[PDB]
Amino acid sequence: LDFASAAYREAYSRINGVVIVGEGLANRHFQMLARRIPADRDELQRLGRMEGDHASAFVGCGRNLGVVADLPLARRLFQPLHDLFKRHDHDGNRAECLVIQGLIVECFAVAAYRHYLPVADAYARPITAAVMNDESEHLDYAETWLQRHFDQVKARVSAVVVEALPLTLAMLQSLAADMRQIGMDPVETLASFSELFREALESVGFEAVEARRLLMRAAA
């Protein structure tokens, strides 16, 4: 792939834009969670600050390429998912907020970065791999909490998953053409997401059979 080509730099502006905004929103999400899970306020605030650092790292990746990131477009694609999160926050639905940011968004980030890594430029590759090392800490928090409460939350989790997964699938469809132009296979990226996200649901308490069902539902 030619990093100087028009097709690459245009698609890159948009994928980098989504990454930058998404990391931004992950920061905002953890801060909202911190102010509703007082027991782990310090921890959640550190995780949020981690997201801040991820955002500025990816800001630098685009500046290394000399591409301006399309932040307006990213703000637009993220609005349905962020609203859904803002609605759960507003009703004190900390469980559903944790599934959205902590499992769904985190697993999408991991899937995306896994597929970007082998086609990333030499500046971006180390940074990307380090960011990937951080996201397990984010996943473990959400998995631990949700596991501890599995019994009270299970139904609410299944339901928020059904609401949320479609929004992230719409984002992916929108971005699939750009992902191809920067060397990511959006089909294989989605597959990786599915594997990761099933591992996460398992890890909470869902039966392997139930994990697959809840996903396939959301697919169809």
Q: Which is nearer to Fe ion, 65 or 139 (CB)?
A: 139
Q: Which is nearer to Fe ion, 23 or 96 (CB)?
A: 23
Q: Read off the tokens for 164.
A: 């949320």
Nearest distance in Å: CB 135, Fe ion? 5
Kindly state whether residue 9 participates in binding Fe ion, applying the rule CB under 5 A.
Answer: no
Nearest distance in Å: CB 74, Fe ion? 14
Tokens 């890890």 correspond to what residue?
A: 203
Among 13, 138, 146, 214, binds Fe ion (CB under 5 A): 138
The alpha-helical segments, DSSP class H, found in 3-123 are: 6-34, 41-65, 71-77, 79-90, 94-98, 106-116
Nearest distance in Å: CB 101, Fe ion? 7
Nearest distance in Å: CB 26, Fe ion? 5
Q: Which is nearer to Fe ion, 8 or 17 (CB)?
A: 17
Whether the CB-CB separation of 110 and 128 falls below 8 Å is answered with no
Q: Which is nearer to Fe ion, 9 or 82 (CB)?
A: 82
Q: How far is CA 20 from CA 27, 90, 96, 153, 198, in A?
A: 11, 25, 23, 31, 26
Q: Which is nearer to Fe ion, 8 or 131 (CB)?
A: 131
The terminus-to-terminus CA distance of the chain in angstroms comes to 34
- Kindly identify the residues of this chain, within the stretch 23-62, that bind Fe ion according to CB under 5 A: 23, 26, 51, 54
Which residue of this chain has its Cβ atom nearest to Fe ion in the complex?
54
- Span of 100-108, 140-148, 185-193, 200-208 interacting with Fe ion by CB under 5 A: 100-108
Question: How far is residue 85's CA from residue 100's CA, in Å, rounded to a whole number?
Answer: 7
Q: Which is nearer to Fe ion, 9 or 103 (CB)?
A: 103
Looking from the CA of 161 toward its CB, the CA atoms found within 13 Å total 24
Q: Which is nearer to Fe ion, 106 or 143 (CB)?
A: 106
Cβ-based neighbours of 69, under 8 Å, separated by 6 or more: 13, 14, 16, 17, 20, 59, 62
Question: How far is residue 83's CA from residue 86's CA, in Å, rounded to a whole number?
Answer: 5
- Kindly identify the residues of this chain, within the stretch 116-135, that bind Fe ion according to CB under 5 A: none
Q: At how many degrees (to 10) do helices 124-148 and 150-181 cross?
A: 160
Whether the CB-CB separation of 189 and 179 falls below 8 Å is answered with yes
Nearest distance in Å: CB 8, Fe ion? 23
Nearest distance in Å: CB 23, Fe ion? 5
Q: How many residues bind Fe ion (CB under 5 A)?
A: 6
Residues that bind Fe ion (CB under 5 A): 23, 26, 51, 54, 106, 138
